[PDB]
TrEMBL record, chain C:
Transmembrane segments: 8-30, 42-63
Organism: Tetrahymena thermophila
Protein's name in the database: Ymf68
Gene (name only): ymf68
TrEMBL record, chain F:
Organism of origin: Tetrahymena thermophila (strain SB210)
Name of the featured protein: Transmembrane protein, putative
Keywords linked to the UniProt accession: Membrane, Transmembrane, Transmembrane helix
TM helices/strands, residue ranges: 49-73, 85-102
From TrEMBL, chain I:
Top-rank lineage group of the source organism: Eukaryota
Protein known as: Uncharacterized protein
Automatic annotation (TrEMBL), chain K:
Keywords: Membrane, Transmembrane, Transmembrane helix
Source taxon at top rank: Eukaryota
Protein name: Transmembrane protein, putative
Membrane-spanning ranges: 58-77
Source species of the chain: Tetrahymena thermophila (strain SB210)
């Protein structure tokens, strides 16, 4: 016998994880595209340092990927926080001696 | 007995024939249901043949109608055959509908005789 | 468990003729100010034919409804080896009778 | 269903008895774990063994309700798809002949082809003969390939477990049915002392 | 014309009529507007999924005799209706006939 | 990501989704003696949520039919004057939109708990659904396969030894 | 609100510190055992036998621990190109050059170590036969995982508390 | 006053007496008979006993 | 200053997380107060930093010196704050000066107790430990469940089960204190015992070593701020 | 700043709007319902806004004529659209397999079908 | 399923202690919340306090949504009614009464108000229902129904 996580929390976590994985793949693709487009746009009209343009493109790509993945990541984080708090409290109640 | 629901497949023609045959001679089917099935099978035959004959009769007159008289052969034949097909389909559909409806009714009666319906408690 | 809920999946198909007649009537009411008496005869004929079909359907429904109130069925007496048709009353839902 | 093991004739096992020593099923009887092609192009090569696998399963499961239904459904679907393809091909051929008899020719392909220099009419006739069969093959291939991959995985799991009987949904013929004893004399009535 | 829908109209109204007072403390749950808004959001999500996501397949067998007539077994746990034994036996006999 | 994540009737984007009509259909193949207290409580909560949702259901479709009827009317807005025609058109159109909505699956946490339950209640529910409702069970199994939920009764199971009871659709293994 | 700068930050983003019961609530039994073994090895070797601890330390060094350091060093060396960045004939800015090098190279080292860890840790944890054997030998339970997480938090707190007076600690 | 000027019928349905000032000497463009039954069959009017019994 | 949920997210009860958060709050708030005080100094001493332009000629000629000096002043302020809060500053554990932060007595006592009495489990919980913990679900209520002895289910003797059940649950003896459990644990981690490392039976309870109030460490409460009397 | 973004309102939010000249610059050479609506709207705006009277009366007469013409055009459009909708409904009901797989349980009432109080409602016992 | 140890019949001293506890619990109740004194009074008071906190949160959220969603959404929505769909300025199309709106932009203002006010109210209500947690008083398993007596409420 071993400790059994709550079935409802388990199902919610599974759904959140599946959504998070799909959103992670989508966001990786989106961020790559955003970095490429940012580099192109900066080369189009911006006259500044190449390092500065590259840093701006990287920051823009990261921001775009986060904005594409913020919702799913936040939902997963909230679900994980609730489940972990519940599990820790239950285990501390069980392990108290 | 068969599944019920929108997603479930409809009863097939061969399945309906098999069900009618089972209801026609089953030793576990009551005499009232047997008489109902026999009466349904007997009278339902006239409708289809009568409809086919009506199509054959009306279509002949439509083949010699005023405008039908002086049309090319292909168009005249098509127009003439048009009434016959419609009336034959009507008669056959009426016969099949009557037979299958009474068959379904008999099936329900037989299921009641054996209590084969969920939530049907006396 | 006797909800007797009839599926709406056939109700729309059954009822469509009345809606078509209403739409034709609205069109005729909008067309009368701009059409001619002879030009509008086709609408009147079509409306009359649709009303006739509806009337036939309603007559068949009325006949079927009045029939269920009297249960006449044939039963086989094997004593005389015959089958005779009798008539008897029935017990059903008061809601069904009101409907 | 649930066939009684006492009345369960191991005819499938008999079929395994007649199986030769070179059958992969024997390797499956030895434990050959079967893996469906996880490589896309490889699965394309796997898209042509469905009929052979179905024949093998029919040899294995002549009484299984699921196997018989799958066989009948596959045959009916193949017949319907082939009839539709043949009707389309015949209609296309007749229409092409008649429209060319009046000059109407669709220049979908090149009017004169490269190399062989075949006429557009001949090329269109060949394309019309070819395409519908390929389309029906692709569609029935998707359907029956998924179904047969699942069925063959089930069969391999059953053979690797050395289960030599038929599935629980196997309806053997009437010859394999033990008739039921009709006469059953009830116990004579006896008063309970209490 | 739309008069046969008495059972359809009875459902929602009788469902709403069964609720006792919230202050009477039988269930203590009052989530009307909450249900409306949450169901609006959920239905939007469900429609979006039905539109641009993987759709459950509807293709099914259509040429086998009584292919949908499934009997109780170990794959069914035999937890069917208490009187479904007659149906199972009839299904088995019909399968023997069609085999 | 609404804050009412712990709501009994709340739902997620990719949870178990079932068509509303199916819900009512699913209510036609169960026995109350087969459910334990947890299953009974889940079923009662689902029944109450379904009552409220079905009450609010056509109302959600109300704007769609009204706009479509006006769209089907033409390019003129005779408010309260063409009201009769608009009302007949709405009485026709609303049934279609209502059927389309009732045929659309809707994700629900309670629906996921009732169906995909590791408990014996969930096992019995799955078995009875697979037995009595072929189409509904096939649709549920097809949806669950893409959700990576593997139950023993599922027809699209690669770890089974008995032949599947229904045809398998094209699915990526 | 700048606790990220004045406290310890490299101890939480490496060596499986992110693994929590949530992950254990999502994987299967064998995967749960593997993850628990990896977490126990990375966080609390005290519960592990000395031989298994030595083997796990060697495996971690061969897989990530030395590899992450190598990747970070490579990134920092790449960043260290042209150390005389601001240099002129009249004068060379030594303080400026040293400060720029120190600020650039550590950031590159951190980026490289993080990238190497995030890239290789999933494969090393998932597909290490030695890790699988250790998981089979140990079979840590849920209570063991909870105790390990608690002990890891306590040790992390102790690490910050122990080095509280590094300039003058008379001790009274 | 605006309502009575706009839709006098509604004013009659509202029982609002003619608010137009007819002191100008010219009769109003639209006179009407008031229906004060709503203003009468109330607990604060002649229908006090009837409204009280009803309540 | 570590948030109550995050410390509760990590395995900890309500009280233990609160105490750990109190310690972390002390450290982090001392550092933050020092840093913010350094920030208030620079906003006003900007002219003063340029006022001493005669005692150091290089600052005016080399601007980097000014920035370095500002950073050094900030660092000195942070160190002063750390000495004010994170230092030892041993003092009397009396009722007159405890609490008031002329000494860091409470923080020092909590840190020393945590550093001393905290040790890892250093072993794996025995099969009986998990089983007893699995049987410790809900039985911690104030009204103790009337455990019944069943001859066909509990077996052995009625008194034997009654004594065994009393020792397991009623007597309050943890599985860490069972004789057979201790013997098995000594047998289980014997290799580690062969290494000469002691195996702790009961896990180190953070609640038994940390206390923001300091009542565990026997610190006399402030007279003006506490009705209760310590010691 | 916030006031400069909230307290003051956009000019279009306060000013009485004008006519979108771009929407009235280029027009197709067809007497469409769009052109009819444009004429009707121009007439209505002139009538509601013009201070003069003679042009208002002329535009009123023209507006009555345009109302007649728009009624004709709308009648034609409504006829076409309604015919299309009815044909679509008929076709959809013609090709969609009507599900005759509903439960027959509501179609029977055994205790009602055969009177359970058979002759028990016919006279008491004693 | 595990039953607890059944206490014995309490003595007069324990009876007096319970009476004192009940008296203190009864005297503690303010008269501002008229709840009947029955078995479920304590659970009713607890659920009422939880619902009051939830309602206060919901009203605050409704106020916040009304303040926020307006300038973001309603005000731009006003630009949708600036001109008619035909591109001309919005003309007054009377339904039943030919109301004489002689003011400058009276027609546009009245139409925009009659349209936006329900929109603003509905948007505020939706924002409140979306951004307010009802889980404080929500009970998935209806576990709040346990009856607690005033004697068990307090210990003297």
């Amino acid at each position: 016998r071993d400790f059994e996580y709550n079935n409802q929390d388990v199902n919610q976590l599974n759904g959140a994880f599946i959504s998070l994985v799909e959103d992670e793949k989508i966001g990786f693709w989106v961020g790559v595209g955003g970095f490429a487009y940012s580099q192109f746009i900066m080369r189009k009209f911006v006259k500044s340092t190449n390092i500065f343009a590259s840093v701006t493109s990287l920051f823009a790509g990261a921001a775009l990927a986060n904005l594409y993945t913020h919702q799913s990541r936040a939902s997963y984080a909230r679900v994980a926080a609730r489940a972990n708090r519940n599990a820790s409290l239950a285990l501390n109640k069980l392990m108290e001696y | 007995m068969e599944p019920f629901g929108t997603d479930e497949r409809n009863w097939t023609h061969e399945e309906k024939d098999i069900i009618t045959r089972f209801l026609k001679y089953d030793k576990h089917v009551n005499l009232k249901t047997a008489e109902m099935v026999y009466s349904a099978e007997v009278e339902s035959a006239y409708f289809g043949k009568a409809g086919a004959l009506a199509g054959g009769v009306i279509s002949a007159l439509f083949f010699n109608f005023p405008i039908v008289r002086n049309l090319p052969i292909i168009r005249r034949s098509v127009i003439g055959v048009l009434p016959f097909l419609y009336c034959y389909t009507w008669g056959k559909n009426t016969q099949e509908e009557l037979r299958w409806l009474k068959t379904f009714a008999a099936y329900q009666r037989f299921v009641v005789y054996h209590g084969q319906h969920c939530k049907l408690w006396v | 468990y006797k909800t007797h809920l009839f599926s709406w999946r056939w109700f729309l198909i059954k009822l469509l003729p009345s809606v078509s007649i209403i739409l034709l009537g609205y069109y005729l009411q909008l067309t009368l100010k701009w059409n001619l008496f002879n030009k509008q005869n086709t609408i009147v004929l079509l409306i009359t034919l649709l009303l006739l079909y509806i009337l036939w359907l309603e007559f068949y429904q009325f006949y079927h409804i009045l029939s269920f109130y009297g249960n006449i069925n044939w039963a086989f007496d094997y004593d005389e080896y015959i089958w005779t048709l009798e008539l008897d009353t029935r017990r059903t839902r008061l809601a069904n009778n009101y409907i | 269903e649930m066939i009684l093991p006492h009345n369960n004739r191991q005819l499938a096992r008999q079929y395994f008895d007649s199986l030769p020593e070179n059958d992969i099923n024997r390797k499956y009887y030895e434990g050959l774990k079967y893996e469906t092609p996880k490589t896309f192009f490889g699965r394309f090569l796997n898209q042509f063994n469905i009929d052979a696998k179905l024949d093998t399963l029919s040899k294995f499961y002549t009484y299984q309700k699921t196997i018989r239904a799958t066989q009948a459904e596959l045959q009916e679907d193949r017949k319907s798809y082939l009839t539709n393809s043949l009707l389309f091909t015949a209609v296309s051929w007749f229409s092409i002949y008649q429209f060319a008899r009046k000059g109407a020719v669709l220049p979908v392909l090149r009017e004169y082809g490269r190399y062989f220099g075949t006429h557009r009419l001949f090329r269109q006739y060949l394309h019309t003969l070819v395409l519908p069969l390929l389309y029906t093959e692709y569609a029935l291939n998707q359907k029956y390939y998924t179904h047969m991959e699942h069925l063959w995985t089930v069969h391999v799991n059953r053979l690797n477990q050395k289960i030599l009987e038929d599935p629980l949904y196997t309806f053997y013929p009437q010859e394999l049915n033990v008739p039921k004893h009709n006469i059953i004399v009830p116990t004579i009535f006896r008063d309970t002392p209490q | 014309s739309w008069a046969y829908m008495y059972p359809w109209l009875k459902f929602i109204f009788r469902k709403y009529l069964d609720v006792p007072y919230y202050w009477f403390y039988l269930n203590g749950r009052e989530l009307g507007i909450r249900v409306f808004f949450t169901d609006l959001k959920l239905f939007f999500y469900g429609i979006t999924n039905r539109l641009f996501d993987f759709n459950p397949s509807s293709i099914k067998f259509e040429k086998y005799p009584f292919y949908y007539w499934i009997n109780s077994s170990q794959l069914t746990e035999f937890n069917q209706y208490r009187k479904f034994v007659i149906r199972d036996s009839i299904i088995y006999s019909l399968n023997n006939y069609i085999i | 990501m609404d804050n009412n994540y712990h709501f009994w009737g709340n739902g997620d984007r990719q949870d178990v989704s079932l068509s509303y009509e199916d819900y009512y259909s699913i209510l036609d193949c169960l026995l109350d003696e087969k459910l334990s207290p947890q299953g009974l409580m889940k079923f009662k909560n689902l029944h109450e949520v379904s009552m409220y949702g079905v009450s609010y259901v056509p109302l959600y479709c109300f704007p769609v039919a009204y706009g479509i009827s006006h769209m089907l009317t033409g390019k003129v807005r005779r408010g309260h004057s063409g009201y009769r025609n608009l009302f007949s058109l709405m009485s026709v159109v609303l049934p279609f939109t209502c059927w389309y909505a009732y045929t659309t699956p809707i994700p629900r946490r309670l629906y996921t708990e009732i169906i995909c339950s590791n408990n014996a209640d969930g096992a019995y529910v799955r078995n009875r659904i697979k037995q009595q409702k072929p189409g509904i069970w096939r649709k549920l199994s097809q949806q669950l396969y893409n959700k990576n939920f593997r139950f023993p009764e599922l027809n699209q199971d690669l770890t089974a030894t008995e032949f599947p009871l229904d045809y398998v659709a094209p699915h990526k293994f | 609100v700048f606790e990220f700068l004045f406290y310890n930050q490299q101890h939480k983003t490496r060596n499986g510190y992110f693994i929590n019961h949530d992950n254990l609530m999502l994987a299967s039994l064998e995967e749960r055992k593997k993850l628990i073994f990896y977490f126990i090895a990375n966080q609390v070797p005290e519960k592990l036998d000395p031989v298994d601890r030595v083997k796990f330390n060697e495996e971690l060094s061969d897989n990530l621990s030395t590899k992450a350091r190598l990747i970070g060093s490579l990134t920092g060396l790449i960043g260290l190109v042209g150390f005389p960045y601001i240099s002129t004939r009249i004068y060379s800015r030594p303080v400026l050059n040293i400060g720029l090098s120190l600020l650039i190279c550590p950031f590159l080292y951190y980026v490289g170590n993080q990238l190497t860890y995030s890239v290789w840790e999933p494969k090393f944890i998932a597909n290490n036969n030695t890790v699988c054997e250790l998981s089979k030998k140990y079979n840590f339970t849920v209570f063991d995982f909870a105790q390990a997480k608690k002990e890891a938090h306590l040790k992390a707190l102790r690490t910050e508390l122990v080095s509280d007076n590094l300039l003058y600690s008379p001790g009274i | 006053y605006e309502l009575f000027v706009d839709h006098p019928d509604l004013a009659q349905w509202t029982g609002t007496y003619p608010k137009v000032d007819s002191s100008h000497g010219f009769p109003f463009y639209s006179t009407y008979e008031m229906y004060r039954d709503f203003q009468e069959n109330t607990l604060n009017s002649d229908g006090s006993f009837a409204q009280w019994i009803t309540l | 200053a570590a948030r109550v949920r995050t410390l509760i997210a990590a395995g900890f009860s309500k009280e233990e997380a609160e105490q750990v958060a109190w310690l972390q709050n002390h450290q982090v708030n001392g550092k933050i107060l020092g840093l913010f005080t350094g920030g208030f100094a620079l906003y006003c001493c900007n002219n003063y930093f340029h006022y001493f332009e005669r005692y150091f000629p290089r600052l005016r000629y080399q601007p980097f010196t000014k920035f370095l000096a500002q950073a050094a002043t900030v660092y000195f302020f942070f160190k002063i704050g750390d000495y004010y809060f994170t230092s030892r500053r041993y003092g009397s554990n009396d009722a007159r000066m405890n609490g008031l932060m002329y000494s860091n007595t409470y923080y020092s006592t909590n840190k020393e107790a945590l550093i001393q009495n905290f040790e890892p489990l250093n072993r794996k919980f025995t099969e009986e430990e998990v089983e007893q913990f699995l049987r410790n679900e809900g039985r911690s209520q104030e009204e103790k469940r009337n455990w019944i002895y069943n001859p066909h289910i509990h077996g052995s003797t009625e008194g034997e089960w009654k004594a065994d059940i009393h020792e397991k649950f009623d007597s309050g003896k943890a599985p860490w204190e069972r004789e057979h459990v201790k013997a098995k644990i000594l047998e289980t981690n014997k290799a580690k015992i062969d290494a000469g490392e002691e195996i702790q039976l009961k896990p180190f309870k953070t609640l038994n070593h940390l206390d923001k109030t300091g009542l565990l460490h026997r610190l006399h409460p402030f007279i003006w701020t506490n009705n209760w009397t310590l010691l | 700043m916030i006031w400069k973004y909230l307290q003051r309102t956009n000019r279009g939010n306060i000013i009485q709007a004008g006519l979108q000249h771009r929407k009235f610059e280029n027009l197709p050479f067809k007497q469409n319902f769009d052109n009819l609506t444009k004429a009707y709207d121009l007439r209505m705006w002139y009538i509601s806004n013009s201070p003069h009277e003679a042009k208002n009366l002329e535009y009123v007469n023209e507006l009555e004529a345009l109302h007649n013409e728009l009624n004709y055009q709308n009648s034609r459009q409504f006829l076409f659209r309604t015919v299309s909708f009815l044909l679509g409904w008929a076709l959809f009901y013609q090709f969609y397999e009507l599900p005759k797989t509903y439960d027959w349980q509501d179609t029977q009432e055994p205790k009602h079908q055969v009177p359970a109080y058979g002759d028990l409602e016919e006279g008491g016992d004693e | 399923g595990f039953e607890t140890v059944v206490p014995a019949p309490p003595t007069r001293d324990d009876e007096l202690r319970m009476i004192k506890a009940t008296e203190e619990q009864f005297l503690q109740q303010p008269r501002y919340k008229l709840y009947m004194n029955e078995a479920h009074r304590i659970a009713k008071m607890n659920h009422g306090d939880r619902h009051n906190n939830i309602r206060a949160h919901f009203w605050s959220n409704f106020a916040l949504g009304l303040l926020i969603t307006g300038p973001i959404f309603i005000i731009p929505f006003g630009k949708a009614f600036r001109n008619l769909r035909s591109g001309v300025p919005y003309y007054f199309r009377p339904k039943y009464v030919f109301t004489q709106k002689n003011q400058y932009n009276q027609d546009r203002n009245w139409g925009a108000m009659k349209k936006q006010i329900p929109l603003w109210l509905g948007l505020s209500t939706a924002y409140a229902y979306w951004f307010t947690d009802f889980s404080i008083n929500d009970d998935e398993w209806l576990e709040k129904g346990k009856v607690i007596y005033p004697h068990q409420t307090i210990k003297v």
